[PDB]
UniProtKB/Swiss-Prot annotation:
It comes from Severe acute respiratory syndrome coronavirus 2 (2019-nCoV). The lineage of its organism: Viruses, Riboviria, Orthornavirae, Pisuviricota, Pisoniviricetes. Responsible for the cleavages located at the N-terminus of the replicase polyprotein. Participates together with nsp4 in the assembly of virally-induced cytoplasmic double-membrane vesicles necessary for viral replication. Antagonizes innate immune induction of type I interferon by blocking the phosphorylation, dimerization and subsequent nuclear translocation of host IRF3. Also prevents host NF-kappa-B signaling. In addition, PL-PRO possesses a deubiquitinating/deISGylating activity and processes both 'Lys-48'- and 'Lys-63'-linked polyubiquitin chains from cellular substrates. Residues 1-164 form the Macro domain. It catalyses: Thiol-dependent hydrolysis of ester, thioester, amide, peptide and isopeptide bonds formed by the C-terminal Gly of ubiquitin (a 76-residue protein attached to proteins as an intracellular targeting signal). It is found in: Host endoplasmic reticulum membrane. This is Papain-like protease nsp3. May form homohexamers. Interacts with N protein. Inhibited in vitro by GRL-0617. It is a multi-pass membrane protein.
Amino acid sequence: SFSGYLKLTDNVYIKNADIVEEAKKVKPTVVVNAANVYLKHGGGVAGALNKATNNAMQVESDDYIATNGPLKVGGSCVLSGHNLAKHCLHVVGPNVNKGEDIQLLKSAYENFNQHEVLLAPLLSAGIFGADPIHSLRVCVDTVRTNVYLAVFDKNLYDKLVSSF
Ligand SMILES: O=C(O)C[C@@H](NC(=O)c1ncnc2[nH]ccc12)c1ccc(F)cc1
């Protein structure tokens, strides 16, 4: 059901789209969230996905943290996708604006290999502060399963495709 995506490799596809609108249209098995270790979904992709769930994502996330403690940078957990997908894979890429190690970006993308197909944002890009051209290269060199990337910023999408 994914449509209008540009094929970058055998398994990586990309589109200039709002991941919330894409998830509402496709209802994928898995939507990836650009999470932090506390699952505090304030801004960026996380804030937008949580708002689309009417805060149900944050209520579920707070119960998960109260039981399990925080995730590791480079780690993930599978929770409900609520009204957006069957599941949400919350993945923690390093936040360069918080001083985190960019070398953990490959470990973050490895979580995608546990799922046959995913709708996802570009990890550690945007307000997480990493070079998005680097994030796209690590994605295509790490993920082996079928990944549909939704890039919100139009200017960024154009820059990523022309430089790929
Ligand atoms: O412009 C971009 O694609 C990069 C940016 N993505 C979004 O904020 C983004 N991407 C897709 N759908 C969206 N809907 C509402 C926001 C949103 C970003 C990626 C990872 C991250 F950790 C933080 C931000």
